[PDB]
Symmetry: C2
Subunit: 490 residues, 2 copies
Amino acid sequence: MLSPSEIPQRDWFPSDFTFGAATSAYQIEGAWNEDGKGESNWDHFCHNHPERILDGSNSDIGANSYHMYKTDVRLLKEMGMDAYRFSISWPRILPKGTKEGGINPDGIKYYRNLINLLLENGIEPYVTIFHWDVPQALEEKYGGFLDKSHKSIVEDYTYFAKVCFDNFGDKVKNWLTFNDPQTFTSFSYGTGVFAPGRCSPGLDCAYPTGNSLVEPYTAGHNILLAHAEAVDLYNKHYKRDDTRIGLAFDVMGRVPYGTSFLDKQAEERSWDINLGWFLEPVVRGDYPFSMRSLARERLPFFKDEQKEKLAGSYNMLGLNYYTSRFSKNIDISPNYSPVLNTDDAYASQEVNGPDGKPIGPPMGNPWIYMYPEGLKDLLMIMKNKYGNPPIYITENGIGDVDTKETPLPMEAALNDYKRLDYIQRHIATLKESIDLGSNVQGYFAWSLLDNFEWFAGFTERYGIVYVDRNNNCTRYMKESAKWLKEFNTA
Amino acid sequence: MLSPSEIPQRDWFPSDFTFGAATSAYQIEGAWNEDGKGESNWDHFCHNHPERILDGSNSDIGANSYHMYKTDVRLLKEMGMDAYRFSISWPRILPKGTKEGGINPDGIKYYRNLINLLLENGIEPYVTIFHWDVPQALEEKYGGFLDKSHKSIVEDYTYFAKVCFDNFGDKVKNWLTFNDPQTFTSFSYGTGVFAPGRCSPGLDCAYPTGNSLVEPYTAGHNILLAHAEAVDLYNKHYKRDDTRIGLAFDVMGRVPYGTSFLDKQAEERSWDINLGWFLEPVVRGDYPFSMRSLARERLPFFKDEQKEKLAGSYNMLGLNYYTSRFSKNIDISPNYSPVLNTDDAYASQEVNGPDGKPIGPPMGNPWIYMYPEGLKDLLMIMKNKYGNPPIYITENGIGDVDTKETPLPMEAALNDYKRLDYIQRHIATLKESIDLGSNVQGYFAWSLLDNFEWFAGFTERYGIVYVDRNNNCTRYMKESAKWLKEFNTA
């Protein structure tokens, strides 16, 4: 348990530092087929493959934030949050996903009202343009981000961004093109645990007719081109001195498994395939050398023109941090063959070190182990290797397990001391990292609300604010939310 | 240049520290076809392709050390050298390079007498078994180290090794299986400037029908297998508590060209392809990860049993250092295709940094630039990354250019102050390295004598002792030799 002097204080950070909460459209909105909203890959996947969701649920209602946005703002305001990061639903704005399909007026109106209400309450909006919700129309037309041409999806995404810029740009000063590109490509096309659920034949996913060694890279390539093109557009016609744009990467810290220089090299390849994959291209205009030498022809090349648009295509960067892993070396040899795109790193990602102990105490769900040190390591890397750009921890939190077999009593769900302790530690880590020179400028507690958790469905509660789906999605502040309130209010 | 207090003193090093000089058989012996000595790849290359030698010479005479070894020993004694590193001519011991061809008694006689003379004069012999002089018989039989079976050359070398252990093991306490395996493979089969002169079609060498991207690796693989087999034989039947065996690697220091992390990565790949290529296998039993990822199938895999014999196959390691280079990153791209095996590191090795200035002052010939710091970097790498094993700088020196067009007058050749300054600086660097914890135990000035310099023929004088080939290879000490004498006997 942290001691009194170890609990972070708002005044530990500069006056302009940003503290907020975050969410994603498909996870909280609900109203999935309401007011003209088009169907998304996730609507499709959940409805057609409930057996691929842990509890067979879907986000038809989620946290019902489409209808309850005023309450979400009230909660953010009561907590004294400086900002709120949320995402826009592509199919809710462009039901057909394209210009020809037309812009959905109600979709525009919804985010318009949410943005104005936030600003009216002094909360700065950090708008994520895309969070895995691809219009099913594009998915059917050309496989969405699997688009072999590297043109259709890029054009349609760019137009989608243009729509957000045209309608919200006068109000929004912070844009995030993508969120978690690595998890999206690896889970949607590698292990196929995410919509549309594709993987190599022989693997266990809904559609074992893809290629876990190629499709993740194809999609990743399209995401980068889309990002570069959107940023080019924003810069040319929408940017203002006081506005910024970037993207957020999902990243787990990497620590050498053992003492051999071999594990340090494995650790190196691991940061590369996780963070480098999408970060290096926006920083320097191309993928990490490691990945190029290992994925080879399975990793598409950029044109010199694309490298240019990509290099430096951001004013700030988001970092979604939750845990870390020990990276253990795997030699190139006839005995080993990569199966998943992530195997190209030639390193196993271990939870337990050589002493058989976990890298950090388990937080509850199957993958989160508390290791704040990794966040510092990550920040030091951003600082010393990637130009120390403005950083925002766009996601940080834990999931409280709550299953039909082992329900989490409301009272316990509210007394989320483990979550509180975890959040406090990472915030403390940021304070340390800042003193060390890290250009981090904000922290967003992940999940303002308890909501849908993709393949985990509703088996986990990540919110700092409880949502009782049994009672009109009523929100109740958890101890974590209450401390943050005290923190920002102090 | 170096102030009085900066000049190294013998008392700067431990009393057991070793100071010596070195040479190689083909470069100094002469008597290429005397007393039953068989023809070597180098005898063949020089005689058949004199046009591939800068001054069209050969080493039929060299420094005539076969007949003049006695004076070589006297010089070494005069300088108070602790040890003498020389190599054994494979074809002189085994004219047909094999057991069936029989052992040549005169060959055994010569080295046996050199060894006894050295010892009776208190000079420790450090014997290099192979220094590029492959019996032509084996070359014609199966291409020598190009042996596609990875069997014949291995057994023939092992037997050659056995012959050496049998006849000299009782007196020799320090063995070096190979010397400069990287230069040998790269120059003999990559650029083709070394015997037999093979390179990829389209390249300029005597036999542009090889493969500069494959043959260097094949030969390298055979060298490693040969080494492991010889060390295994040695450890099982000849090694005594006071004897040691290893090999020596040629290595240029690598420094990132610019300040980008990309050049640090390039620097990394450069150490790997130059030093790691042969070092990592004898340390851990396999090639560097970088090389396997880049050379791929052109880099043979070791059987588990071979990996076992290779890992830890040495009691000491030799390092042949002369200069360093700035490693500049080269991205993997459809625009770049490796032509030479060395291009596999995706890094250009530059003499001049971004400021257009050379990494170090030019020492005279076309490739040596004085950069003592590079030696320290190398020693620290050995220390912190490769187990800090006993290290002997088995080679270090410079080559005084002496051509027909621009002869080096004897007076100018004897007053080799550039060489003297260069040697004193590297010796100082060893003292600094020892203080940093380096496990270096000795230093060998390269070229006891002025001699044949491979493709450079006699256009360069690397000796600390002048050899007047015009007279009868009469030897005269240079200022460098005189200082070393003062140094050792002070």
